[PDB]
Design a protein around this ligand. Sequence first.
Ligand SMILES: [Cl-]
Ligand SMILES: [Cl-]
Length: 97
Amino acid sequence: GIKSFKHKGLKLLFEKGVTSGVPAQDVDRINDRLQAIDTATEIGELNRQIYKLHPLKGDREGYWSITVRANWRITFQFINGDAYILNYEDYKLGPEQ
Ligand SMILES: [Cl-]
Ligand SMILES: [Cl-]
């Protein structure tokens, strides 16, 4: 399950159905990714072609990324079947990752 958020927009969407903090057009796909993270018990369940699952490195060691659309990505820690510190970002990852 999802246990914590860094990004208030994702938190409000997931917990309350409030859509103010994300692009309107993306609400359904963001909910799809959140629901996938929430129901996964192992990280490989998120290794779906359209999700572009990627473990992050360096200062982001311990985090994972999945893609909503374009460069829109949800990042999180995944530990003992639960997801933590969920964040939302809009940029492509660089070569050191
Ligand atoms: Cl939280
Ligand atoms: Cl796992």
